[PDB]
Design a protein around this ligand. Structure first.
Ligand code: HEM
Ligand code: HEM
Lengths: 361, 361
């Protein structure tokens, strides 16, 4: 009943944390495999981590929990595990790597930093409470340290629980309503867009994650005229309505023109370039905001942990980003991708099973 | 009514953020004055910041707000401004610096880092929502940048709103219930312990802040035996009860002995060394937790933003810390102060007034 006692099921055909409505906090933990971590070792690793998530998400201490009193109040804690391209070579399982699971191709907007890119193994931990989250992260590292090195850890947040109603769209650190057009969990379009059905059999019921750390150049954004800001996106700042409508969820009319005959939503508006007509081909956007550090003279380092889930990186992610990589895409003046990683996310498990057992077992 | 629409009054005899029950998130912003920032400039600065807090805490955009749509949902946003020792020399107001407002004396446990210590000007921003908080921080830096350089920014969190009931004690990242013995806002003991009445007149109705960034050596803490953990503190881990009682709020009996004649609460137990018999001399503890970064092999960098408020640093803070600085203080094995700063926090203001006007006006 409480924000603190509420739980998310750990077991199911799918891993939690994907269809789960985004919780208030997230940590994306990126791990590289140690020299001796092969197929057997990854099995022991995933069995450890599986049981940790199984207990902690239900508010129970992990086995050998160093802080058992931090286990209760799970606050909708979820774990989502993902396998990077390198994990299949280390496992001797190159035959099982999906064809599209590989570093994204270069984009003109890219300013990618190694310290925010790549990784053999992802542990994505989401939770409505940051103390519960912190404990879950320590326990993960307690069992992963023998097998892996920490490549990076990216921390993000959304609104605190209760600040806005459930399902209402939340704003990003540019002040924009962010998440209006999105596959809805528990619809035909969602399952077909998100859950893998083709390709190697182990991944069916899983998905893929494209995780891109995108900096917001807020100093430049601030000085941008507000009417220019709406022209660049294709929607109004306060209402979130498309420029052709009046309410946030009005459907963007990409054929409307104005008095002078010009498109109401501009040719390079961000919702035009990013739109895909076929809903079943769309990506699931499930981002978190980040805010990290200030320089001496007061420049912010903040932006978006852009988390995209799709059944097929080549069909559903790369074309959109390629289309965004154009010159007239005005949002590129104010955003800069500084990190890129891709992960194959296995199906869920039941009792007696473990995450990744279909691949590594 | 909502966690998001709830507000804290900005105006009053005292600044908010001190007696205010701690909100879910905090940022402590440490600023050093630029070479040209004297008494007149500090007046313009404090008038800018005052009006920013006045509007933003009530869910209204600041003047020249770059992200006005991030102003609503204030979520109990508060600002607390503090003046460092150097601020009085730059203002030509050395006569008005409280005698005790100076860097803390050295302690044996100290491992102080310049990047977490000192500062001429504090902006402490607390809020139940991290997006609201982030916007408030950007607006603060927007108006402070011309006058100051950012020395440090320390970010901290407690439970999310709704995870525990109001007033229930929350745990720290060592799993300990933290905050049981504390002056209660709106009692004689609180007002006498917290609000300045003696010393220079401008500070009456204000207070002082001792802000110490204290790292938790969690790798060592984890390997410490649980019964040893309770012996070191003087209280039980799950219940929070003193070793002489059964419930969290039972009064510690510092005269009880066991069968063998030995003190039940040990001579160097952390609640014994830190206890002050006279409640009116106690400090107000209002800490935040921090969790920042992992090394390659999985060591955490986490701990406590220990925020202590008192009318008199020499009478109410330094003796306790000095008493904690002893050799048998076992908590010192697992905690390390890595940052120290002190601030004089002015009284509040009304409309037509501004924070610090009694000092700088
Ligand atoms: C910091 C970077 C970005 C910001 C601030 C941003 C912002 C927005 C905003 C304000 C909207 C309209 C509201 C909504 O429907 O969510 C939107 C829509 C969308 N964005 Fe972005 N976006 C960013 C990056 C990206 C990237 C890299 C992609 C890559 C695929 C992407 C894909 C989409 C899609 C598919 C939509 C839905 C458009 C539609 O069909 O109406 N966004 N974004
Ligand atoms: C990371 C460092 C620290 C940790 C983990 C810690 C933890 C605790 C715990 C678990 C308690 C008992 C529960 C409570 O009443 O809050 C306590 C009490 C207390 N602590 Fe600490 N503490 C730390 C540092 C400090 C420091 C530096 C001071 C400096 C004055 C201090 C002053 C006090 C006081 C006054 C009490 C109340 C004791 C009583 O009269 O019963 N603590 N602390």
């Amino acid at each position: 009943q409480t924000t603190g006692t509420a739980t998310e099921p750990f077991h199911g055909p799918h891993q939690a944390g994907i269809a789960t409505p985004p919780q208030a906090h997230a940590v994306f933990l990126g791990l590289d495999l140690r020299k001796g971590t092969g197929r057997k070792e990854l099995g022991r690793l995933m069995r450890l981590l599986t049981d940790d998530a199984r207990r902690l998400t239900q508010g129970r201490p992990a086995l050998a929990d160093p802080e058992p009193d931090l286990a209760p109040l799970p606050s909708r804690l979820t774990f989502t595990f993902g396998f990077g391209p390198g994990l299949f070579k280390a496992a001797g399982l190159e035959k099982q790597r999906p064809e599209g699971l590989r570093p994204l191709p270069p984009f003109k907007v890219d300013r990618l930093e190694d310290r925010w890119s790549g990784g053999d193994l992802l542990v994505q931990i989401c939770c409505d409470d940051p103390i519960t989250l912190a404990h879950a992260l320590r326990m993960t590292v307690k069992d992963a340290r023998a097998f892996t090195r920490v490549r990076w850890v990216q921390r993000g947040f959304r609104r605190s629980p209760g600040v806005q109603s459930s399902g209402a769209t939340q704003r990003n650190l540019m002040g924009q309503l962010d998440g209006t057009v999105n596959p809805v969990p528990g619809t035909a379009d969602f399952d077909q867009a998100v859950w893998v059905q083709d390709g190697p059999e182990w991944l069916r019921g899983g998905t893929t994650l494209v995780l891109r750390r995108i900096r917001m150049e807020l100093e430049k954004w601030d000085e941008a005229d507000p009417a220019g800001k709406e022209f660049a996106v294709g929607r109004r700042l306060t209402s979130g309505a498309p420029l052709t409508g009046r309410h946030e969820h009005d459907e963007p009319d990409f054929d409307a023109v104005d008095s002078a005959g010009f498109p109401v939503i501009a040719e390079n508006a961000h919702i035009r370039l990013a739109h895909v007509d076929s809903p079943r081909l769309r990506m699931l956007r499930r981002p978190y905001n980040y805010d990290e550090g200030l320089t001496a003279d007061g420049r912010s380092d903040a932006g978006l942990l852009f988390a995209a889930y799709q059944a097929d990186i080549d069909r559903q992610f790369i074309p959109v980003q390629r289309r965004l990589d154009e010159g007239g895409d005005l949002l590129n003046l104010w955003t800069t991708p500084i990190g890129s990683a891709v992960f194959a996310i296995p199906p869920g498990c039941d009792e007696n099973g473990w995450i990744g057992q279909g691949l590594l077992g």
